Amino acid sequence: KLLEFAKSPEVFDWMVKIRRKIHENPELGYEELETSKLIRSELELIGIKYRYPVAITGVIGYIGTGEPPFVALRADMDALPIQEGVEWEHKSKIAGKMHACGHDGHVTMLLGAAKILHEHRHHLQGTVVLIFQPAEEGLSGAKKMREEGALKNVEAIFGIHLSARIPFGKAASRAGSFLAGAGVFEAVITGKTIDPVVAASSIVLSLQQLVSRETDPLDSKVVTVSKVNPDSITIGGTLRAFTGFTQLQQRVKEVITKQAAVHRCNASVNLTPNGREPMPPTVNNKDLYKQFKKVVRDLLGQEAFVEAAPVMGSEDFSYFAETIPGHFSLLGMQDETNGYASSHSPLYRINEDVLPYGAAIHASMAVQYLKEKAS
């Protein structure tokens, strides 16, 4: 029944106005002042006790008994420094900033889920923790909330991401590794006279050789050299893998090291340069995935769940999912003729008719998780 509640004028109209208010006033990482104030106003109106501030602008709400088991639902708050190209009534009023990744929709659907869960709060066998996360785009926000104790005593966390790659109203996931990890590296190459330059060009080519694509998408490995700048040469770049992420880091370091040595050079390799720690692959807990497929099929029909392919994208939800059982899913918006622009596009649109689906999926997943836990 919560789908029909999610679609009702009361809830749907309210979600649309919230979404559009955020959309008109996009804020970047750690600067989500107005977005944070709106979330907190709505929690108060529902109402729902919360902790604030968490990671400057972040907010954590609670619904249910107030006691364990705690299950978390997550939305991200931040926009991107992109000029909106969509001409419409609720276009960004802030030039050069836009919600081009659906994050306005994510906050809204989580507030929708909070409204829905609150109506059933006395039946929840535990507590739903609503995590409104700042600064996803710079990949530091989830990590900062984790540092500040956002996951303490939390047994599971679920996140939804709106997608133009999945058809409207379908939800997509897969068990295990889902989104690729990402790391950076910096190496300094020094002679033990042309040897450092020779060593560097050799290193650059040997590293470019570690890019591997095969027939299983999870095997894909990317190593990029983005920086090279003669007494010493500094090489920097990035690496990505769905699996064997640590082994790829070690292989990058081994290549730099061995190549420098055979060119009579020293090499200093840093795999966390300037405190840039790697972000691990986003792994969907198998038990949570199984629960999610059943939730989605019960709520929206057998055909509504689609198995997602691995994605080489950037999503800091990985930091939550590395520390507790995590589940990250895609919620489709795409129409039959591919009219919805990709994430990050200046032409990105949310199909607002999706908002009730995400609200219901969030709510249902929380309820079922707690129910199953009790059984």
UniProtKB/Swiss-Prot annotation:
Disruption phenotype: No effect on the sensitivity to the inhibition of root elongation caused by IAA-Leu or IAA-Ala. Expressed in leaves, stems, siliques, seeds and flowers. Detected in the distal tips of cotyledons and seedling leaves, hydathodes of leaves from mature plants, pollen, ovules and developing seeds. It is found in: Endoplasmic reticulum lumen. It is an enzyme of class 3 (hydrolase). GO terms for molecular function: IAA-Ala conjugate hydrolase activity; IAA-amino acid conjugate hydrolase activity; metal ion binding. Its cofactor is Mn(2+). Keywords: Endoplasmic reticulum, Hydrolase, Manganese, Metal-binding, Signal. Optimum pH is 8.0. Mn(2+) 2 binds at C101, H103, H161. NCBIfam families: amidohydrolases. Belongs to the peptidase M20 family. This is IAA-amino acid hydrolase ILR1-like 2. It comes from Arabidopsis thaliana (Mouse-ear cress).
